[PDB]
Design a protein around this ligand. Structure first.
Ligand SMILES: [Cl-]
Ligand SMILES: [Cl-]
Ligand SMILES: [Cl-]
Lengths: 247, 247, 50, 247
């Protein structure tokens, strides 16, 4: 045989490159996944991740209450935190024994897979009683925030999209939904009559994941890295795997 | 300048009237919210509210178990209430230490925003095992109950729609879903191929809210009133804000 | 991160203090002023910062 | 340049030696720290360390009760140990359910920094009700125990001073204070009128540290060694760092 890495007859090398390119390209096909992650960052350094993975379109929607820190199998101040919610829903509405709940998120990162069309991204960032813009009567039910998403890059390849906003003020009390549509450069509408019931089935087939990690390090090590997910850490360092035309 | 409230040159007055009219009219546009509330009334005087706010269409769906009273951070008889559910799902199926669970709702009020089309309203009022009409085989999955909705009015303006039914009998054991479609007097179908993926995204963008209030007074004071929501109290008194062509 | 950890310290003296006498020992978590005892001045005169 | 370690022009080498000598010599200046450690050894192998670090003079004073083992966040027999204290303060004064409290120290090691003057060391080893010598009326409030202190040595340099006494008998029930003065070979009295208010301020500026370590190994590894402290372990092995005229 020819010697490795010296000719066009390195079939091992050609198949390795095709195997990675096929994964990149299958994800961006209408057969492929589109994925979203919401990361809620707590003052104790822990991170709630909510992930959803589906065909055609994907989204996450969470109440104010649902985004607050919950430590499985430890004390949570569950009675005082009910009182906190009453004081967040209406000023002086509660009888809590604290000024600021440490269960409140300090920040949100939203990440989309590279199979999203950025121009389709929509966010409903609500007040604590799940109203997008002060009152329902004057509320557009979403904002198109695609222009704010940064490219997560590894080796010059887009491996995901990140929108990050801090909640460092006492009045940063939010409900949150986000939504993106899978890339479709074709003129076959996946929602046309031919395929619309497949899109309805995708709503039931979407897989959800939720976990609280103790630290960003543990998130990078045991969640982002093993699953080849894209990520952007507090030091602006990019994680993910470049696949397109790569060994 | 002209004197206030004496001529057509009161621009402050004209802009105030337009500001309110624009809110009324934006809500009823296809860009606007349609909202539903389910109120579950308990014997202890507390009220569970479930709210959902979305574009194009909106709904709530709850199991028998999910509508039962839950007091965050207090004792709930959690083991005996598992036993109650077994005796509700099948006669003599449980080993509870009580005849009647006080966690069972005594009544339900369903309220829709004034941006709903009443003729689109649909309700699935199920038995305790989530079957609409005795057996699945003979079940229509919904009833069109729009004719039963009363107009919530303030100053002669429709500010919402109310359907109220009591559950005062031992055999009133229910699961519950309700659904309404946003007003669309146009011949642009929001579900046509052009916009259907926007309707799929609205399913992910819908914002949910859920809270147990200790009393109707607290609900009116700290939930209905501050958010300019419509409401109908046990004394048949109407709440909401009239906006159309009003200062 | 323990939420019990202080996020800030304010030190206030009455107006009867002489500011030039003020001394602070801001130690590490094992109560050593400056990295090791051997090289530690037991205080800093921080009056100029008040 | 000259080659490393072959001439008097190794300035790297000369600065390394000066850096260590300056630390040794600064500690022994009147600007420097004088430090004391009390180690209380428990039957379960754990060790309470109390450290104090101050200018000019330093001391520790602890009640019988304060030297007993306390396990943060575990059960301590807190009611029965109140009863033990009553039976220690006066024979048959208590109603404890045990002959010997395992919270009682089995031994004490007192260590001073090498900046102490050994001839200034004073100890008040009291009975369980904090009386130095049987009755207050006949009590000298201290003993000058300097002659009993062993030199902790590394590489022929004194890195600290150790006095160790076991408490292996049932009647070994003690309160304890110890005190040493910083080296002052000069005839400038740090307590003269010129500097006495600086010595008063040193009383407020003194830094205290207290922790229970699970084992002598953990004490050597995570307390003694990282802080360059002197120590003498149960096997008579010396710890510390020699600094004087050393690289
Ligand atoms: Cl395709
Ligand atoms: Cl419109
Ligand atoms: Cl000096």
């Amino acid at each position: 045989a020819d010697v490795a890495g010296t000719s066009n007859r390195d079939f091992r090398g050609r198949e390795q490159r095709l195997f990675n390119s096929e994964q990149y390209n299958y994800n961006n096909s209408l057969n492929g996944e589109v994925s979203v992650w919401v990361y809620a960052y707590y003052s104790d350094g822990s991170v709630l991740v909510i992930n959803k993975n589906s065909q055609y379109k994907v989204g996450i929607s969470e109440t104010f209450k649902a985004l607050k820190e919950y430590r499985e199998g430890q004390h949570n101040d569950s009675y005082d935190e009910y009182e906190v919610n009453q004081s967040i829903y209406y000023p002086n509405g509660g009888d809590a024994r604290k000024f600021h709940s440490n269960a409140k998120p300090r920040a949100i990162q939203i990440i989309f897979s590279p199979s999203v069309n950025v121009r389709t991204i929509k966010m409903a960032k609500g007040n604590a009683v799940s109203v997008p813009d002060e009152y329902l009567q004057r509320s557009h039910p979403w904002e198109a925030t695609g222009i704010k998403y940064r490219k997560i890059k590894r080796d010059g390849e887009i491996v995901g999209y990140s929108h990050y906003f801090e909640l460092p003020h006492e009045y940063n009390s939010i409900s949150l939904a986000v939504s993106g549509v899978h890339k479709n450069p074709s003129s076959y509408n996946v929602g046309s009559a031919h395929n619309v019931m497949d899109v309805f089935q995708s709503c039931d087939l979407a897989l959800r994941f939720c976990n609280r990690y103790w630290a960003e390090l543990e998130l990078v090590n045991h969640y982002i890295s093993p699953n080849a997910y894209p990520y952007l850490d507090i030091n602006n360092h990019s994680y993910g795997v470049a696949l397109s035309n790569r060994q």
